[PDB]
Structure formats: structure tokens, C-alpha cells
Amino acid sequence: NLPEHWTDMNHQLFCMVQLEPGQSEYNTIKDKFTRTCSSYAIEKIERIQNAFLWQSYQVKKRQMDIKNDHKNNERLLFHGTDADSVPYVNQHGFNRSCAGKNAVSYGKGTYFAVDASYSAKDTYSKPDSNGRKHMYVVRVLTGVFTKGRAGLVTPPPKNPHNPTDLFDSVTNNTRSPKLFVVFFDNQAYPEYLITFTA
Amino acid sequence: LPEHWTDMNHQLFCMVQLEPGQSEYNTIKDKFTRTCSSYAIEKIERIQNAFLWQSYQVKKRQMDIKNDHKNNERLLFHGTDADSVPYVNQHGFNRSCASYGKGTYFAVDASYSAKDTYSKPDSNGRKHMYVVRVLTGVFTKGRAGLVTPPPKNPHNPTDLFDSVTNNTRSPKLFVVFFDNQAYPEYLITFTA
Ligand SMILES: [Cl-]
Ligand code: NA
Ligand code: NA
């Protein structure tokens, strides 16, 4: 049941759609990026249309919407990546088994930044052999969250006497969240890919 | 939500103890006793987890569409220790807890899962294994260190097998690498 602003893909399941700088769609992403990354320059922004990831992600959104009490369950966040991971992410999304350590670790899952500046660090968005850096703009199901800790393999339980009722994600700091970690597949939809440069 | 599930009173999760001697129980007990006739069954419970089921069915449909006329689903076993039972009931099998890859492992034969290393006897001597619907799909031989299955063709590196196995001609185990590929359908509590 695919979004109606999507390009018609003609029975195909995957497509990257190049956005056009006049569009509000392009400019809102650009502005979100330049909020913290004004020193960097955008080459192109591509919309990612992946039917299967979209469908699995939306089911999990519905479930989290049901389980949580009228919460705002989804945030739009950034993830820097190397060029070599781009084909995999476009197709298969974010895999906790493939994630690198963060400089500051709040668990073993996939990290998503509030600020594009964070993701824009050479450590996360490594320059390809042409100087191009790569960052995804992601819908992430952050749900209800707590401060994480380095050893986490899943989010911690809300209550220790009920170990299976879990927070949806973890953050560095619940007062001022700058990162969120997710620990399950299809909890994050890669919506746009920003190609950018110095 | 499948028909043989019994009414949930608008709940999204429950465990339903099966009635011995009726068809559902006999079908699952037969699968088990095929290889573990020396073990005693204490009870079998049907796991009715609406959220896991929904995500599993989504993936089953996608794989049915993606694969050329394949039988993508198998019934397999998984031994678990007692302390992991509430987690699995609620959230399934997680590769991040857990020789042929860093995924979750499912046995063809209940005998494999009956091993104490997999279905660790609790304090009462009670062992636990699941009967599991697994999206095995198109599979290939696994090997250590895999974090996803290999690509079907090394020239389309993102087009992946669905699962791996120890032996493709005669598989005794399957390894899946994602969260929506294994539904815990029944829990068998039993003794040696
Ligand atoms: Cl097992
Ligand atoms: Na709700
Ligand atoms: Na098909």
C-alpha cells in the first residue's frame, strides 16, 4: 500500500528517485541538513522507494502506534554511511549486525543522529574515492525511550520485574536527545539519500 | 490471524495450552515423537502473538512474491532455556543473543533441539523447545562469520539467499539472519 507521492514504479519493487531543487521535498531536506551542516554542499538528494522495507516498517509503526499511548513514535533522523554500504541499505535497510561502534556507545544497534553535523563526520560518512560523502534521512521508530548503555543488545525493560516489556529505543540523554539506537530490523526506513561534498 | 487460534478477548498476546488427544496436539506431538519418543510431553502451548504473526506474514508474502514458485516455509525446532521463554514468546528469536553464520538456528529434528545444551533442563528437570515456522526460502550452504546469507549471484551482491544450511542435499539445520523470518508457533514442555 505505497505512498501516493511516489513515482509509479511499474510493478517494480525498488527505485531511487532524484529530487529537483525547486521542490518543497528537496528544500525541506536541504534545510534540515544545512541547519547544522552549512559548511558542506549537497550534490543530489534521492528519494528511496523500497516497497518491501516500506511495508515491513509501516506494520511496525502501526503496532507501535497501537501499543504506545498516543505517542509521537517516529522521528526523522540522519545516518552517515560509506559508499560501499549504500547498495545494501537502499535494498535491505539498517542492519545492527553490520553497525560500527559509535565513539560513545549506548548499545549494540543502529545509530541515528538528530543533527546532520554528527552524521557528516568522516568517521560516519566516509569520503568515497571521489570525495563524495553519503548520509541517509531516515524515518525511525524511536517510540518511548530511555538513556542507553554500552552493553545493550536490545533496549532495556521499562520495569526490571517485567523483562519482556521493552523501551522502543535508547538515547544518549532523554533531556536533550542527540542520538537514538534501534535494535530490531524494520524499525527504520531509509527515506532519502543525500550525496554531498566539501 | 489464523482460524485455529482461539478467541483472544481483544488481547494481542496469549499462550493457549493444547488439549491432549485432539487433532492440533496430536499433529505437534507426532512431529516431536518422530525423533524424541523417549521424552515425556508435559504440555504443548500454541503461541498467539498477533504482532509477531503480522510481521512474519508480511515477510512470507514478500518472499512468496520474490521467489519463483518456491515453498518458502518450513516447520522446525528450537531448544531454549527456561529463562529465555518469556522473551521468545513475546519477541521471537534474536540473532543478537543466540558455525554457519551469525543468525538464529532451527533444527529439522526435535532430537537435535532436545540436547541439554539447547533445551537446558530447568530446576524441575523441565526442558523446553519451540515448534517454529521458518521462512527458509531459497537456501545455500552456510559458513562461519556470515552476517546475512550469501548473494544468489556474486554479480548482484544485494540479491540474497533466504537462509543457509549445514548440508543443502540433506539439511539438519537452517540459519536465518533477520527478525521477521521465524514465528514461534508452539511451545513443548517435556522431560528426559
Ligand atoms: Cl535447537
Ligand atoms: Na495506542
Ligand atoms: Na513468485
- Report the run of H or E that residue A158 belongs to, with start and end: none
- Rounded to an integer, what distance in angstroms lies between the CA atom of residue A54 and that of residue A93? 10
Strands (E), chain A: 14-18, 41-50, 74-81, 110-113, 133-141, 145-147, 169-171, 179-182, 188-197
A187 touches chain B (CB under 8 A): no
B148 touches chain A (CB under 8 A): yes
Contacts of B90 in chain A (CB under 8 A): 164
- Rounded to an integer, what distance in angstroms lies between the CA atom of residue B33 and that of residue B28? 9
B67 touches chain A (CB under 8 A): no
A18 - beta bridge partners? A46
Please identify, in words, the CATH class of the domain defined by B1-192: alpha beta
- Rounded to an integer, what distance in angstroms lies between the CA atom of residue A62 and that of residue A60? 5
Cell numbers linked to A97:
549486525
Identify residue A196 by its one-letter amino acid code: F
A158 touches chain B (CB under 8 A): no
Put simply, the answer to whether B86 touches A184 (Cβ < 8 Å) is no
Residue A170 CA, ligand 1 centroid: distance in Å: 31
For the beta sheet containing B182-191, the strands, ordered from the edge strand earlier in sequence to the opposite edge, are B13-17, B40-49, B182-191, B127-135, B73-80, B104-107, B173-176, B163-165, B139-141
Angstroms from A63 CA to nearest CA on chain B = 7
Residue A8 DSSP label:
P
Put simply, the answer to whether B96 touches A97 (Cβ < 8 Å) is yes
Residue A19 DSSP label:
-
Closest residue of B to A62, CA-based? Answer: B51
Opening angle at CA A180, ends A174 and A181, nearest 5: 125
Contacts of B95 in chain A (CB under 8 A): 97
**Which residue stretches of chain A are H helix?**
24-34, 51-67, 86-92, 116-119
Closest residue of A to B98, CA-based? Answer: A153
Put simply, the answer to whether A55 touches B51 (Cβ < 8 Å) is no
Closest residue of A to B13, CA-based? Answer: A67
- Rounded to an integer, what distance in angstroms lies between the CA atom of residue A42 and that of residue A27? 11
Tell me how far apart the 2 most distant CA atoms of chain B are, in Å.
Answer: 53
CATH fold label, A1-198: Phosphoenolpyruvate Carboxykinase; domain 3 (3.90.228)
Closest residue of B to A11, CA-based? Answer: B65
Q: Do the beta carbons of residue B118 and residue B126 sit within 8 Å?
A: no
Per-residue CA distances from A3 to A7, A50, A51, B89 (Å) = 9, 11, 10, 33
Closest residue of B to A107, CA-based? Answer: B96
- Rounded to an integer, what distance in angstroms lies between the CA atom of residue B187 and that of residue B28? 10
Cell numbers linked to B102:
551469525
Experimental technique: X-ray
CB-based burial label for A160 (10 Å; 0-12, 13-18, 19+): exposed
Identify residue B30 by its one-letter amino acid code: D
Contacts of B102 in chain A (CB under 8 A): 97
Cell numbers linked to B79:
531448544
The 8 Å CB, 24+ separation contacts for A8-14 are A9/A49, A9/A51, A13/A50, A13/A51, A13/A52, A13/B66, A14/A49, A14/A50, A14/A51, A14/A90, A14/A91
CA neighbor of A52 nearest in space, from B66, B30, B106: B66
Chain breaks in chain B (C to N over 2.5 A) after: 98
Put simply, the answer to whether A95 touches B58 (Cβ < 8 Å) is no
Contacts of B59 in chain A (CB under 8 A): 56
Put simply, the answer to whether A60 touches B59 (Cβ < 8 Å) is no
CA atoms within 13 A on the CB side of A190: 32
Angstroms from A196 CA to nearest CA on chain B = 24
- What are the sequence ranges of the domains in chain A? 1-198
What are the phi and psi torsion angles at A20 (to 5°)?
Answer: -125, 120
Helix A51-67 to helix B50-66 angle (10° resolution) is 170
Opening angle at CA B160, ends B133 and A19, nearest 5: 115
Q: Do the beta carbons of residue A149 and residue A123 sit within 8 Å?
A: no
Residue A128 DSSP label:
-
CB-based burial label for B97 (10 Å; 0-12, 13-18, 19+): exposed
